[PDB]
Swiss-Prot record:
Keyword DNA damage among UniProt keywords: no
Listed result of changing G23C: Found in a lung cancer sample
Organism: Homo sapiens
Effect recorded for Y299F: 50% decrease in interaction with PIK3C2B. 65% decrease in interaction with PIK3C2B. Abolishes interaction with PIK3C2B
Record note on what altering L8A does: Abolishes phosphorylation
Effect of R271A: Reduced phosphorylation
GO terms of biological process kind: cell morphogenesis; cell surface receptor signaling pathway; cell-cell adhesion; cellular response to amino acid stimulus; cellular response to epidermal growth factor stimulus; cellular response to estradiol stimulus; cerebral cortex cell migration; digestive tract morphogenesis
Effect of E13G: Found in a lung cancer sample; constitutively activated kinase with higher levels of basal autophosphorylation; more sensitive to gefitinib than wild-type
Modification Phosphotyrosine, positions: Y299
Residues in cross-link Glycyl lysine isopeptide (Lys-Gly) (interchain with G-Cter in ubiquitin): K20, K41, K58, K61, K223, K254, K264
Phylogenetic lineage: Eukaryota, Metazoa, Chordata, Craniata, Vertebrata
Protein name: Epidermal growth factor receptor
Residues in Protein kinase domain copies: 16-273
N6-(2-hydroxyisobutyryl)lysine sites (modified residues): K49
């Protein structure tokens, strides 16, 4: 393995400004904020992740692993760590993803999301994932809930809580069978969860195996049962979902294949997804001083 020269950047608590809350519950408490690097005359919209108030040592070992992973990734369809703040408790800082989690976003906008968007998202996520594969990370927690929306046209994979290097050492409904039965995890098991992620999108945010309790899942999945074909889905699109769910993990698509297929499909989006009222579908920030606002994507350091 090659040296990981990712630069971990530590940031003074005084570099943040306005800080409203966005997410609570579980370990979570995620805030919206503003980060003004040094004397640099840029304001950077940021999200800030604490693993609760109670700074109990167990939590910090988990959050620091996350930081290590997020600090190591560099690609447009994957969220990067801007740095950390060593306050009383540990804070992760990352580019604010203004439109939130993709899951909530599809739920929130069923009526105005069209085929081009859905297919483009699939393309972008297959890219994020192929990027991780190159850097040999197994994400282990791909789901619509862990995909964030920079703009309706730009999605990025986040939440590296469970990311690991291939061959190292619990959301059941997104997990490949080998993972549920043997804790085997591979790029190919990520593809399984990719399958499920796609299904969440094609159903505008349904819950996978709604009603069935997580303990039964591997039983069902052995019987040969899979998620049903979503209404908007041609067999072409659904057959791709289904291949993500083969028992033989090597018989599953590669993320590189997924990019190509979804890409082809996104050139003629009405031939693959049937959405009522499709074509006529158009989708789309809080301070007077916005002169100096720079997206993190345009904020680079040598
Ligand atoms: C405007 O909304 C967000 C922007 C975000 N921008 C960047 N990152 C977010 N989350 C996040 C995820 C993992 C991380 F390590 C860090 Cl540092 C941040 C963000 C989370 C955001 O909302 C968190 C999700 C809010 N919902 C609330 C309802 O239930 C699902 C989650
Ligand atoms: Cl679950």
């Amino acid at each position: 393995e090659a040296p990981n020269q990712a630069l971990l950047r530590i940031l003074k608590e005084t570099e943040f400004k306005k800080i409203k809350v966005l997410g609570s519950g579980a370990f979570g408490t995620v805030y919206k904020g503003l980060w003004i690097p040094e004397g640099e005359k840029v304001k950077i919209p940021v999200a800030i992740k604490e693993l609760r108030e109670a700074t109990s040592p167990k939590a910090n070992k988990e959050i620091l692993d996350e930081a290590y992973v997020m600090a190591s990734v560099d690609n447009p369809h994957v969220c990067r760590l801007l740095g950390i703040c060593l306050t009383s408790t540990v804070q992760l800082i990352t580019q604010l993803m203004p439109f939130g989690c993709l899951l909530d976003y599809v739920r929130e906008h069923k009526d105005n999301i069209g085929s081009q968007y859905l297919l483009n998202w699939c393309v972008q996520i297959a890219k994020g994932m192929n990027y991780l594969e190159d850097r040999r990370l197994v994400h282990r927690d791909l789901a619509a809930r862990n995909v964030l929306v920079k703009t309706p046209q730009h999605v990025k994979i986040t939440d590296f809580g469970r990311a690991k290097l291939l061959g190292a050492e619990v959301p059941i409904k997104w997990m490949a069978l080998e993972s549920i039965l043997h804790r085997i995890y591979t790029h190919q098991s990520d593809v399984w969860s990719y399958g499920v992620t796609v299904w969440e999108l094609m159903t505008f945010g349904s819950k996978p195996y709604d009603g069935i309790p997580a303990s039964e899942i591997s039983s069902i999945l052995e019987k040969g049962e899979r998620l049903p074909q979503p209404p908007i889905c041609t067999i072409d699109v659904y057959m791709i979902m289904v291949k993500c769910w083969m028992i033989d993990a090597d018989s599953r698509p590669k993320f590189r294949e997924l990019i190509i297929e979804f890409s082809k499909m996104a050139r003629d989006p009405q031939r693959y997804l049937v959405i009522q009222g499709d074509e006529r579908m158009h989708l789309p920030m809080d301070e007077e001083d916005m002169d100096d606002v720079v997206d993190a994507d345009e904020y680079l350091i040598p």
